[PDB]
A paper describes a structure:
In the absence of cAMP, PKA in cells exists as a holoenzyme complex consisting of a regulatory (R) subunit dimer and two catalytic (C) subunits. All R-subunits have an N-terminal dimerization/ docking (D/D) domain, a disordered linker region harboring an inhibitor sequence, and two tandem cAMP binding domains (CNB-A and CNB-B). RI-subunits are thus inhibitors of the C-subunit, while the RII-subunits are substrates as well as inhibitors of the C-subunit.
To ascertain whether calcium could substitute for magnesium in the autophosphorylation of the RIIβ holoenzyme or whether it trapped an ATP:Ca complex, we diffused CaATP into the apo nucleotide-free RIIβ2:C2 holoenzyme crystals. The RIIβ(1–416, R230K)2:C2 tetrameric enzyme was crystallized and then soaked overnight in 5 mM CaCl2 and 1 mM ATP. The structure of the full-length RIIβ2:C2 holoenzyme, solved to a resolution of 2.8 Å, contained Ca2ADP bound to the active site cleft, indicating not only that Ca2ATP had bound but also that the phosphoryl group was transferred to RIIβ. Both products, Ca2ADP and pRIIβ, were trapped at the active site cleft. The γ-phosphoryl group of ATP was transferred to the phosphorylation site (P-site) Ser112 of the R-subunit, with two metal ions stabilizing ADP and the phosphorylated RIIβ in the active site of the C-subunit without significant local conformational changes between the Mg2:ADP and the Ca2:ADP bound structures. The overall nucleotide-bound structure and the nucleotide-free apo structures are very similar, with a Cα RMSD of 0.67 Å between Mg2ADP bound and the apo RIIβ2: C2 structure, 0.65 Å between Ca2:ADP bound and the apo structure, and 0.46 Å between the two nucleotide-bound structures. In the Ca2:ADP structure, the C-subunit also stays in a closed conformation.
Residue numbers in the entry:
A (entry chain B): 14 to 350
B (entry chain A): 104 to 121, 130 to 324, 337 to 392
Amino acid sequence: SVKEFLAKAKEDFLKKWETPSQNTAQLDQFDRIKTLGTGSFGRVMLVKHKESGNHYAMKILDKQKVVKLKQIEHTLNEKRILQAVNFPFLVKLEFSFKDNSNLYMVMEYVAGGEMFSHLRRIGRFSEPHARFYAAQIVLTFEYLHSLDLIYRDLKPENLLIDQQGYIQVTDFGFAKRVKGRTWTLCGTPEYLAPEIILSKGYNKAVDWWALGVLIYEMAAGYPPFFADQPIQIYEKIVSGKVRFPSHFSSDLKDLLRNLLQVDLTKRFGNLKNGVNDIKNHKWFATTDWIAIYQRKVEAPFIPKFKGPGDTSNFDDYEEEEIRVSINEKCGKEFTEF
Amino acid sequence: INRFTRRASVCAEAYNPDRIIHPKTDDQRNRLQEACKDILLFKNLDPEQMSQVLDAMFEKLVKEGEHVIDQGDDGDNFYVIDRGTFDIYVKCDGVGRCVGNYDNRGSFGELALMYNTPKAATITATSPGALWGLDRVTFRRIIVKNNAKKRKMYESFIESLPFLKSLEVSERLKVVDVIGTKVYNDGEQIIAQGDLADSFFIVESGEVKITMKVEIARCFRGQYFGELALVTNKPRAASAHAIGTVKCLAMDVQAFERLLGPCMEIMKR
Ligand SMILES: Nc1ncnc2c1ncn2[C@@H]1O[C@H](COP(=O)(O)OP(=O)(O)O)[C@@H](O)[C@H]1O
Ligand SMILES: [Ca+2]
Ligand SMILES: [Ca+2]
């Protein structure tokens, strides 16, 4: 059980990894209903498949904008990696393709909206409410890491709630396959591991760092390190000194210390017992890791749906027209897409 | 609340690490080293990384009235003032204003060294002046390169350690990640006989003299000592002292175990 399946996931991934899916569909197979988010750069749309009438989320990427911002390698990763993984909490890539002006990733719709939006509206999360989400990330990061893949962008803006109250990890722009050590300074400021900031070179450890941050934010309503100007946020992250609000159950704050540890020789997930240190922690006692995986647990919150194609849980952006030029742009750079 | 504003991702130029020297006077250099002492990205730097970076800094001249940087103008550049006077000002709306001042001291732009960040104000030379500039890609190469040269290989030393030969690569890098550095002066005592054996060492540069209570060894670059702290904590039979100026790799042995369990388990397999 717990034994072979591992290998099967790597067997599976690897095979899909070495020969990725290519121009599954095309633009005219879809109706474009509403913007869900302004990607950089960027624009995620709700789309209605025609032959099926079913809905999706389309990630439109301006090929030129990507080149000007130097996100060639990252973009190929996002897509290559995303069409090769499979796990209950990773969003599914249904079709991918490209045209003269844009790249397109079409995905399953997650009607529930961003964690971020709920959290902010709701103020903060009860601990079992926080814990329920945090369990999925832990399991997800174990899946990813086992394949030698780091995610590098954990934040409530990249975590969407699905119709069953569960989570779908979402923005794979910074995800990457690292066997030794990697150096790119990227992520989101409030969430950057100190080794990233100080260009120490780094791998799996930064995700677990970010996990500590997420959790502290899910329960606090604000992240551990914040400040007016960014450099001060970094200053704080490097000291790794953190206050916990009065209401953090002792066990929570204990887990947060082991994860929010600047000293890699003491940071949970990174030690001899790897992840189990986190699962068999003290703040996950009530968690049945097997159940959560089978999505058999009661969600402490179900987003309100209406019919399919409902966007109520999302914000409203101004709709500009998606231009597809008559001249192919940046053809060579995305050949592999 | 500003509670609902989302927090964008940030991302600098990649450099997979797998010639620049701008002359400056001895003093100009010291003043530069002091203006960066307490800047986040410089605080914690090899004095050689620091030296390499202080080489990289280019000279930038300015006649009075000249714009050093323009608000919203690109900030892939950090700047530290050498000489001159300087007004800072912001077009807050709407309204152009002066905020503070610069008198032959002061710096700005550091966040530029991490990712693209458009200057928040326009700085203007209120006299003839000079600055040192540093651009992100340059600065990051220096520091990425320098650490990769200090990662693989920091290892070889480690994989030349008999007690560790049977480590996996994923594990040895774990140690490369955290192994500390120590610097020693002539005759300074590295290890004390009969002291708790808390960690092992490896000489990066210099010479260490092992002695007992009588020279019983001399270690040069690439060679380890105290390496018994891995198998047993029983008190050092000998002592160590520095011959010249030594830099040592020091690995607390407990930390080692938090990462890998007991070294002896390794030396089975
Ligand atoms: N499949 C999807 N379903 C619903 N919303 C999505 C989906 N994919 C992205 N979004 C929304 O669009 C925005 C862009 O997603 P992301 O992948 O982070 O792009 P970027 O990293 O360029 O912002 C996010 O804030 C997210 O809320
Ligand atoms: Ca995002
Ligand atoms: Ca992104």
